[PDB]
Curated annotation (Swiss-Prot), chain B:
Its EC number is 1.13.11.43. Optimum temperature is 30 degrees Celsius. Stable at 4 degrees Celsius with minimal loss of activity. Belongs to the carotenoid oxygenase family. Activity is high with beta-1 type stilbene and minimal with beta-5 type stilbene. A 4-hydroxyl group and trans-stilbene structure is essential for the binding of substrates to the enzyme. Inhibited by N-benzylideneaniline-hydroxy and -methoxy derivatives and N-(4-hydroxybenzyl)-3-methoxyaniline but not N-benzylideneaniline. Fluorinated olefin (Z)-1-fluoro-1(4-hydroxyphenyl)-2-phenylethylene is also a potent inhibitor. Imine linkage instead of ethylene bridge in the substrate enhances the inhibitory activity. This is Lignostilbene-alpha,beta-dioxygenase isozyme I. It comes from Sphingomonas paucimobilis. 1 Fe(2+) ion per subunit. Homodimer of two alpha subunits. Catalyzes the cleavage of the interphenyl double bond (C alpha-C beta) of lignin-derived polyphenolic diaryl-propane type compounds (Stilbene).
Amino acid sequence: AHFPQTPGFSGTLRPLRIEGDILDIEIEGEVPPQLNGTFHRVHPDAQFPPRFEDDQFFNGDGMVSLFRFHDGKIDFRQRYAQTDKWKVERKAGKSLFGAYRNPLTDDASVQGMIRGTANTNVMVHAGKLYAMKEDSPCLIMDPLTLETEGYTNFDGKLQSQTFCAHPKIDPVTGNLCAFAYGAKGLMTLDMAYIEISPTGKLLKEIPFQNPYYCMMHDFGVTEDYAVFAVMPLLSSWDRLEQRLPFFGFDTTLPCYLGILPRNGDARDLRWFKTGNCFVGHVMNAFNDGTKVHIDMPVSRNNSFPFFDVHGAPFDPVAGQGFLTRWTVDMASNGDSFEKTERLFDRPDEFPRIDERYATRAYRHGWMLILDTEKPYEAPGGAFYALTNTLGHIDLATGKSSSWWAGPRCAIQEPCFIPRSPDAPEGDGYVIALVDDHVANYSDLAIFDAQHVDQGPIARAKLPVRIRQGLHGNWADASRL
Amino acid sequence: AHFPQTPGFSGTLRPLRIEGDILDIEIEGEVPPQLNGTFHRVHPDAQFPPRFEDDQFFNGDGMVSLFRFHDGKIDFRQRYAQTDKWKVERKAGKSLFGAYRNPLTDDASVQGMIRGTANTNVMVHAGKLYAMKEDSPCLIMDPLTLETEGYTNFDGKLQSQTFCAHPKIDPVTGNLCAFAYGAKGLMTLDMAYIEISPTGKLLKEIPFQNPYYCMMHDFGVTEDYAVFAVMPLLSSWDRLEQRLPFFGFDTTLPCYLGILPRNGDARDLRWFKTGNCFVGHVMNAFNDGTKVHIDMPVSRNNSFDPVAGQGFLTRWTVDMASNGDSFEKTERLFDRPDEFPRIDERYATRAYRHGWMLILDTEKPYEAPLTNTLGHIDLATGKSSSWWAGPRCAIQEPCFIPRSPDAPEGDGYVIALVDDHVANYSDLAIFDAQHVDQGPIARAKLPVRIRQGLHGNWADASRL
Ligand SMILES: [Fe+3]
Ligand SMILES: [Fe+3]
Ligand SMILES: [Mg+2]
């Protein structure tokens, strides 16, 4: 009823909190008639006002959106993920859990509960929808009704208390390749590489130890290795008692890259070391023999201003991430990299690939671009987190193109859809939410993947603006 | 999925069509904590693009909104009324029924089906929600889930094929007082005065004939009489054959006022005649002995030419004791163009003085790419006050809530949706009924603009 009038809950970040349905969205243009599948997507949307006036973006309850493609039509369905947190807070009619990653600020009635909001990523696997949040197990939902089944441990087999929100689909085995940090609770170095079969059975859970008490948000998977990028985004329980941000970036410590053979154990894990930097989302990773490549935006400090870290304001220029390839060789001796190479010279994040080529050699990528030289005429919005541009890069040529959403709009994470199962790499479509911050409408815009610069070929016009979310995924109807 | 690019489906009249819920709406100010009940409300919202690009606003599928008040909180729930039309069209994934009230344009697959959209009014009665559209039976829904149960003939008793969307609640008996026109199908002169008990049982269905086939949208109920305003808004099968709009107003025919004793029959009905004009919604009606008063906006032509469409709240007076068919009085009650009148319905059918209305203030700026004013009139003194919503907003039909059961007439709150046509958000504004010029005392802030609707009603939780 009464949300704190902090910027975190006002203007373009106002609460939405509407579950609902639209049958047959209004289309401007023509939805590609062959497309038949689901595009899932999630945003934080605190059900009730927070205990803390300062409660953060990534702490809001997960609101899941479904866009079902079929017969040149798109349907809309949106539901709260009914996490243990969400269920108990609804019964109380108020928020019971506290600050971000801080159980010391929880109400006494919910101590020991799973504090996850399932607000970071949603992906179809094993005929179900996996709703994910780092600090908590995987939440199982129905891909079409968006009903919540409950957290899972994969029939008692998984020991890890947590489950990452950035798994990859092995394009050969169809296995869900995931991982977990803090696998034995907050502030533990216990890690795990996880593979889930196409029918939901836990196949392997390879434990190992991390170099830091740090955040491990994303990782890479190659044909033979799991790739873990370790940054000094450090955590400490002292900070929670002082009521400071759980994570704080240390600009003096180095970064590591851990290569775990997917068929080995912690004994075979080799650590490589490089200079200090901030590592973003992994576009893709792949190995050529013992040569391992991983592509991700690299910046000098935190790239997300909604992500409150401790110490040293928010440097918006030091937070500019550029798509960078890291290369190590398992055949070499020592912990030296072979190569670091900037792949793209514009600040970017939220990278995407033709997922048929995940874990393999590839050339086509899409990304959100921060074009600060463009006007932004929408009052009530952070100019910092303004992804106003969609970009495409041909890594084989370095050529790139982009599209500007205009001065009224932001763009959310894109997603690639192939034109057909055996279409060439990157031949198909890119979809993304384009949010008009003046009229408060959202379009699910459809681009030609190879000509994003020509603007959308179609727009699914929603009569509502979807709150800025995180990650989404496309699944063909055959996966259901 | 491809709606026409006409004005009736673009801009502020864009399709909405979202069913959904919000628990604990954002509140600016304070929702009066005593309030515990429901505000229902409905707008047209075609589920699929129409068969004809010039489809009327009034032809769209009914979308019902629920605002459940409790303990200073308001929850939101919005659902489609699952009429026979809506169900079959969803099955087919496209619009099967054709032009407004024109069965000659329906697809063959739905011929003889009920063409109602239930898009005009929603009112709690006998523990259920009555969803109404003139050309069709009453639709029964659940007041809290907004589930649909189906059309009703009240246990097979009701003979009328139709059921009005403007019933009044008798403040003494608790009966739902309704009527029906075209009761034996389209273009039929058959009429009926209807009463439904507080438990849903049909108590009386009094048939009579209408002076001609015309729109009979609203009517009045007094302590002793039912009051039927007849204007020459005509329709014939011939109009439908030429694919003209169903209704066509005739400037040369007179208007009638038919007074029917509630406990009598068609032989006891008296017709009074007056000059040509266009009649609008009924604020209220009452009788003082044999003198019958009815207050309603009156204009020269359709208000539902902007100058001819200017309707002014007017009182019509006839005397049942008199001989002949002359009125006694016609008196303009308000000098500003107005519509959607409302009263403290605890005084419905009885003498009253407090009314609320929407006012079209043409001297105000509108900065969007129009009811912009909420009014209050004290009929005992002619005094009035109003509130302008600003250059970006419009106001939908208001509705009165008494501060308490024993409160004096007009003592309480007036609620209405206020729509920002630039930011595309809607607020459920709460005013003090006696000081609407002071602006809202509270705003329930929706993260969406509710489409332009029709009629809504308040019901205390005790009625659930
Ligand atoms: Fe992420
Ligand atoms: Fe009406
Ligand atoms: Mg739109």
